[PDB]
Amino acid sequence: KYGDKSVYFDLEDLGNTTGQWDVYGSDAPSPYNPLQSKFFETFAAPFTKRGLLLKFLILGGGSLLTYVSANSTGDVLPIKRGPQEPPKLGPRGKL
Amino acid sequence: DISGLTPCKDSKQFAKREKQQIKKLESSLKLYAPESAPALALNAQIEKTKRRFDNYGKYGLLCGSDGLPHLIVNGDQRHWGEFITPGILFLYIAGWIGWVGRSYLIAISGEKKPAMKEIIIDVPLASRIIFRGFIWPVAAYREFLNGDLIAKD
Amino acid sequence: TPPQLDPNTPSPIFAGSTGGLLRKAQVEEFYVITWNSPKEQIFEMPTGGAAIMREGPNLLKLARKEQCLALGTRLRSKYKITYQFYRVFPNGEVQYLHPKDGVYPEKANPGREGVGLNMRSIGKNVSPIEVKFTGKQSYDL
Amino acid sequence: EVKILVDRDPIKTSFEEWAKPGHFSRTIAKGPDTTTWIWNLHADAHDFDSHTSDLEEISRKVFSAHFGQLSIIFLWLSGMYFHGARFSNYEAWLSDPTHI
Amino acid sequence: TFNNLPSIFVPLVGLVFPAIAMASLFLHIQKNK
Amino acid sequence: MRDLKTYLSVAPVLSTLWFGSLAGLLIEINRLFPDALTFPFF
Amino acid sequence: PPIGPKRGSKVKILRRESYWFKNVGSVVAVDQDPKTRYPVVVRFAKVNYANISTNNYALDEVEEVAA
Amino acid sequence: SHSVKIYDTCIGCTQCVRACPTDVLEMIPWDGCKAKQIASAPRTEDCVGCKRCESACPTDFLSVRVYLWHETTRSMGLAY
Ligand code: CLA
Ligand code: CLA
Ligand code: CLA
Ligand code: CLA
Numbered sequence: 287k288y289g290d291k292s293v294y295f296d297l298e299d300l301g302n303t304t305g306q307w308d309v310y311g312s313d314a315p316s317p318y319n320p321l322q323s324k325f326f327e328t329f330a331a332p333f334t335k336r337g338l339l340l341k342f343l344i345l346g347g348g349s350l351l352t353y354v355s356a357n358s359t360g361d362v363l364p365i366k367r368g369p370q371e372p373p374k375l376g377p378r379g380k381l
Numbered sequence: 382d383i384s385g386l387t388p389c390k391d392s393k394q395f396a397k398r399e400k401q402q403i404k405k406l407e408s409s410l411k412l413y414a415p416e417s418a419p420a421l422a423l424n425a426q427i428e429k430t431k432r433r434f435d436n437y438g439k440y441g442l443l444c445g446s447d448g449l450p451h452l453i454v455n456g457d458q459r460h461w462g463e464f465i466t467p468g469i470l471f472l473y474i475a476g477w478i479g480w481v482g483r484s485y486l487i488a489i490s491g492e493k494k495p496a497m498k499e500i501i502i503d504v505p506l507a508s509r510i511i512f513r514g515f516i517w518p519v520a521a522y523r524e525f526l527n528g529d530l531i532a533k534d
Numbered sequence: 535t536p537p538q539l540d541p542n543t544p545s546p547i548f549a550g551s552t553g554g555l556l557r558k559a560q561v562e563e564f565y566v567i568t569w570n571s572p573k574e575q576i577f578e579m580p581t582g583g584a585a586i587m588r589e590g591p592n593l594l595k596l597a598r599k600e601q602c603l604a605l606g607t608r609l610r611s612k613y614k615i616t617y618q619f620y621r622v623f624p625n626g627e628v629q630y631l632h633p634k635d636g637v638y639p640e641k642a643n644p645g646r647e648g649v650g651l652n653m654r655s656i657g658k659n660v661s662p663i664e665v666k667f668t669g670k671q672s673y674d675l
Numbered sequence: 676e677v678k679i680l681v682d683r684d685p686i687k688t689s690f691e692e693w694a695k696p697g698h699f700s701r702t703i704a705k706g707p708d709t710t711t712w713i714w715n716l717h718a719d720a721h722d723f724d725s726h727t728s729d730l731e732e733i734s735r736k737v738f739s740a741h742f743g744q745l746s747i748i749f750l751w752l753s754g755m756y757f758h759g760a761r762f763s764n765y766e767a768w769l770s771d772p773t774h775i
Numbered sequence: 776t777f778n779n780l781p782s783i784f785v786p787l788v789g790l791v792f793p794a795i796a797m798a799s800l801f802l803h804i805q806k807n808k
Numbered sequence: 809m810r811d812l813k814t815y816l817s818v819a820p821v822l823s824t825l826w827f828g829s830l831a832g833l834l835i836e837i838n839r840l841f842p843d844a845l846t847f848p849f850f
Numbered sequence: 851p852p853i854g855p856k857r858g859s860k861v862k863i864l865r866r867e868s869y870w871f872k873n874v875g876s877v878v879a880v881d882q883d884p885k886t887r888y889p890v891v892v893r894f895a896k897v898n899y900a901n902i903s904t905n906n907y908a909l910d911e912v913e914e915v916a917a
Numbered sequence: 918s919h920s921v922k923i924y925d926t927c928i929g930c931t932q933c934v935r936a937c938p939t940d941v942l943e944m945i946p947w948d949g950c951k952a953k954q955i956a957s958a959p960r961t962e963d964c965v966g967c968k969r970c971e972s973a974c975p976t977d978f979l980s981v982r983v984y985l986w987h988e989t990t991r992s993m994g995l996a997y
C-alpha cells in the first residue's frame with residue numbers, strides 16, 4: 287500500500303516508490319486541428335526514417351555548405367575577395 | 382690574460398663602470414646639503430665604491446668586453462683566490478657542520494626516545510660536540526679508514 | 535539464518551530533500567534500510583538534512599549501499615539500535631544485504647566461507663611477467 | 676541577569692608546558708615519531724575546539740588569544756608611529772605634500 | 776576553378792567530415808551487440 | 809630557570825638564536841669587508 | 851621446547867615487503883602454537899608509514915642477529 | 918567489480934571490517950593467528966574502492982589489499 291500514512295515502499299507498485307511518475311506528461315487528446323495534423327503527418331513522413339534522415343542530412347548539409355561557400359562572391363565573406371591591396375615587403379628586404 | 386680577458390685594473394670598461402656608478406651616486410648627492418646625513422651616507426657609499434673597484438683591480442680579477450670581473454675557476458694559481466681558496470674554506474666550514482650534526486646524531490642515537498632530542502637540542506651536548514668538528518677532516522679521514530664513517534647495516 | 539522479509543513498514547518524518555532516488559532506482563537497483571527505534575527522535579539522514587525516525591519500525595529507501603551502511607553505523611554507534619538493509623531491483627527480488635548471517639560482520643560467525651583470500655604473504659605474489667598474456671592477475675595466482 | 680562569572684587561577688602560569696611540545700592534545704603530547712608531528716603541531720596549534728571539548732575553556736583561550744592579537748596590533752601601531760617619528764620625513768611631507 | 780577548391784574542402788574537412796565522424800563515432804560509442 | 813632552558817633548547821628557538829647570531833656575524837663581516845669577490849689573504 | 855627466538859632476543863627481518871626490511875627489531879613474543887603462520891611479534895624502534903612500531907613475522911622471515 | 922584480496926598476514930583485529938562502509942569484508946573463523954579469525958571478502962561487487970580497509974590494517978605493509986579493477990555503478994559511488 288503506497289497510499290498509506292507514510293508508507294512509500296509498495297513492492298508490487300514499484301513505479302510509485304522508485305519515482306516513475308510523469309511530472310508533467312498529459313494524456314490529454316490531440317489539441318491540433320485534425321486536418322493540420324494530417325497535413326504535417328503526410329508532409330513530414332519522408333523525414334521519419336532515421337537511417338534515411340541521417341544520410342540525407344549529412345549529404346544535404348555538406349552539399350549546401352560546399353555549394354554556398356563555392357558560389358559566394360567577394361561581398362559576403364572577404365577571404366574569397368583577395369588582398370585588394372599592394373602586398374607589402376617583409377623585414378630584411380622580404381626575409 | 383686567460384680566456385681572452387684583460388685584467389680589471391687595465392680594462393677601460395671597468396673604469397667606465399666605476400665612473401658611471403660614481404656619477405650616478407653624485408647625481409643623487411647634489412640634492413642634499415653637503416654637511417647633511419644623507420649626503421654623508423652617499424659619500425661613504427662613494428668611497429666604498431671607489432675602493433671596491435680598486436680592490437677588484439689589485440686582486441687579479443679579469444674583466445671581459447662587458448667590463449665585469451669574471452672568475453677563472455679552472456685551477457690557475459693566479460685565480461685560486463676566486464674559487465679554490467674560498468672553496469676549501471667552504472668545505473671546511475660545511476664539513477664542520479655536517480661533522481657536528483652527524484656526531485650529535487650519533488651521541489643521541491643511543492637514547493630511549495632519541496627523537497625528543499632532535500626537536501629539543503641538548504645545548505651542553507651540542508656545545509661539547511660543536512668544537513669536535515673544528516679539526517673535523519682528520520676525524521672524518523680516520524673514521525673512513527676505521528670504517529666508522531659508513532654503517533654496516 | 536533466514537532473512538527478515540522487508541514489510542511495508544512506515545517511514546521517518548521528513549520534509550523532502552534533493553538527495554533521493556533520481557534514476558538509479560527507476561532502471562537500476564536501489565536500497566532500503568529498516569531499523570527499530572525504541573523512541574521517536576531526530577537523526578541526520580545521509581541524503582542531507584535531518585529526519586525524525588518514528589517509534590517502533592522505520593523504513594528509509596536510499597540510493598546506494600554507502601548511504602545505508604553509513605546511516606546504519608551512526609545508528610548502531612549513537613542510538614545503539616539494530617539495523618538491517620536490503621537491495622531492491624526495479625523488478626523486485628529484494629536482496630538481504632547487510633548482516634548476511636544475523637550477526638554483524640565484525641564477529642566471526644561460522645558458516646561464512648573464505649572468498650577473496652590468499653594463503654601467502656603479500657610480497658610473495660608473482661610478478662606480472664608470470665601472468666602476462668593470461669586472463670589472471672598477479673593476485674589470483 | 677548578566678553576572679560577571681569568572682574564576683580564579685584556572686591554569687597555572689609555568690614554563691613546564693613550554694618545555695614539553697604539543698602538550699595541548701592527546702596524539703601530539705607524546706613526542707615526534709615522525710616529522711609529520713611538527714606540521715600537525717602547528718596545524719592544530721589554534722584548533723581549540725580539538726584540544727578541549729567544552730566551550731568554557733575554548734572561550735577563555737580565544738579571549739586571551741584575541742588579547743594577544745590586540746597586543747600585536749598595538750605593537751605594530753607603535754612601530755609605525757615610531758618609524759614615522761624617528762625614521763621618517765613627516766615634517767618635510769607636511770611642508771610639501773605633493774612632491775615629497 | 777582551383778582558387779575555389781579551398782572553399783570546397785575546408786568546409787568538407789572541418790565541418791562536414793567532423794559531423795560525419797562525430798555522429799558515426801557517437802553511434803559506435805553507444806552500440807550494443 | 810628550569811624548563812625555560814628546555815624551551816630555548818627547542819628547535820625553532822634555538823634555530824632563530826643560532827641564525828640571528830650567524831646573520832649578525834655575516835652582516836658585521838660584510839660591514840668590515842664589504843664587496844668581497846676574492847680571498848686574497850692566502 | 852619454546853620455538854623461535856626469545857622474548858627479548860634481537861632479530862632482523864628478511865621480509866621483502868616490510869617497512870623494516872634489513873632492519874633490526876626486538877622480539878616481543880613468539881606464539882608457540884604450530885598453526886599460527888606468523889608467530890614472531892617484533893618491536894621496532896622507528897615507526898612505519900602507518901605510525902606502527904610492531905608486526906608479527908614468520909620464523910623464516912626473520913634472522914637472529916649476532917649482536 | 919573491484920578485487921579485494923586479503924593475505925594470511927592478517928591478525929584478526931576486525932578493523933578492516935569496522936571501517937568498511939559497504940560490507941565488503943567479514944570476519945570468518947581461521948587458525949593462523951592469535952585471534953583465530955581472518956577477514957574474508959565475499960561482497961567484492963559492492964566495493965567502492967575507498968581503501969579504508971587498508972588505512973586501518975595494522976600489519977607491516979598490509980593484509981587486506983584492494984586492487985582497483987572494472988568500475989561498475991556500485992564501484993563508482995553513484996546514487997544516480
Ligand atoms: C574549422 C572549420 C570551420 C569552417 C569551414 C567554418 C565556416 C564558417 N563559420 Mg565557423 N566555427 C568553427 C569552424 C569552422 N567554421 C568552429 C570550430 C567554431 C567555434 C569557435 C566556429 C564558430 C563560428 C561562429 C561563432 C560563426 C562562424 C561562422 C562561419 C561562417 C563564415 C561567416 C561568413 O562570412 O559567412 C556568412 C555566411 C552565412 C551567414 C550563411 C551560413 C551558411 C550555412 C553555414 C550553410 C548551412 C549548411 C548546412 C545545412 C549545415 C551544416 C551541415 C553539417 C553536416 C556541417 C562559415 C560558414 C559565422 C556564421 O556564418 O554563423 C553561422 C559565425 O557567426 N563560425
Ligand atoms: C578572524 C580570523 C580567523 C581566525 C580566528 C581563524 C582561526 C582558525 N582557523 Mg581560519 N581562516 C581565516 C581566518 C581565521 N581563522 C582566513 C582568513 C582563512 C582563509 C585563508 C582561513 C582558513 C582556514 C582553513 C582552511 C583552516 C583554518 C583553521 C583554523 C583553526 C586553526 C588554525 C591553526 O591552528 O593554524 C595556526 C597557524 C598557522 C598554521 C600559520 C598559518 C601560516 C600562514 C597560512 C602563512 C601566511 C603568512 C604570511 C602572510 C606569509 C609570509 C610569511 C613569511 C615568514 C615568509 C582556527 C580555529 C583550520 C581548522 O579549523 O581546521 C580544523 C583549517 O583547516 N582556517
Ligand atoms: C563598553 C565596553 C566595552 C568595550 C569598549 C569593548 C571593546 C572590545 N571588546 Mg568587548 N565586551 C564587553 C564590553 C566592551 N568591549 C562586555 C560587557 C563583554 C561581556 C559580554 C565583552 C566581551 C568581549 C569578548 C568575548 C571579546 C571582546 C573583545 C573586544 C575588543 C575587540 C577588538 C577591537 O575592536 O579592538 C579595538 C581596540 C580598542 C578599543 C583598544 C582597547 C583598549 C581599552 C583599554 C579596553 C576597552 C575597555 C575594556 C572593556 C576594559 C575595561 C577596563 C578593564 C580594566 C576592566 C574591543 C577592545 C574581543 C577581543 O578583542 O578580545 C580581547 C573578544 O574576544 N569583548
Ligand atoms: C610569560 C608568561 C606566560 C607563561 C609562562 C604562560 C604559560 C602558559 N600558557 Mg599562557 N598566555 C600568556 C603568557 C604566559 N603563558 C599571555 C601573555 C597570553 C595572552 C596571549 C596567554 C594566553 C594563553 C592561552 C590562550 C593559552 C595559554 C596556555 C599556556 C600554557 C601553554 C604554553 C605553551 O605551550 O605555549 C607556548 C607558546 C608560545 C611561546 C608562542 C608565543 C605566541 C605569542 C603569543 C605570539 C607571537 C606571534 C608572533 C609575533 C608572530 C610570528 C612571527 C614569526 C613568523 C617570526 C602555559 C601554562 C594554554 C593553556 O594552558 O591551555 C591548555 C592556552 O590555551 N596561554
Ligand code: CLA
Nearest residue numbers: 470473474515833834835837838839841842843844845846
Ligand atoms: C650559492 C650562491 C652564492 C655564492 C657563491 C655567493 C657568493 C658571494 N656573495 Mg652572494 N648571494 C646569494 C648567493 C650566493 N652568493 C644569494 C642567494 C643572495 C640573496 C640572499 C646573495 C646576496 C648577496 C649580497 C647582497 C652580497 C653577496 C656577497 C657575496 C660574497 C660574500 C662575501 C662575504 O661576506 O663573505 C666573507 C666570508 C664569510 C662571511 C665567511 C666567514 C666564516 C667564519 C668567519 C669562519 C671562517 C674562519 C674559520 C674559523 C676557519 C679558519 C681556518 C683555521 C684558522 C681554523 C660572495 C662572492 C656580498 C659581496 O661582497 O658581494 C660580492 C654582498 O654584498 N651576496
Ligand SMILES: CC1=C(/C=C/C(C)=C/C=C/C(C)=C\C=C\C=C(C)\C=C\C=C(C)\C=C\C2=C(C)CCCC2(C)C)C(C)(C)CCC1
Nearest residue numbers: 454455456464465475476477478479480481483521522530
Ligand atoms: C679540484 C678542482 C676541480 C675539480 C674537482 C673534481 C672533478 C673533483 C671530483 C671529486 C669526486 C669524484 C669526489 C667523490 C667523492 C665520493 C664520495 C663517495 C665521498 C664521500 C664523502 C663522505 C661520505 C663524507 C661525509 C661527510 C663529511 C666528511 C663532512 C660532512 C659530513 C658527512 C658525514 C656528510 C675543479 C675543476 C672543479 C675546479 C678546480 C678545483
Ligand code: SF4
Nearest residue numbers: 927928930931933974
Ligand atoms: S584490518 Fe587487516 S589485520 Fe585487521 S582484520 Fe582486517 S585484514 Fe585482518
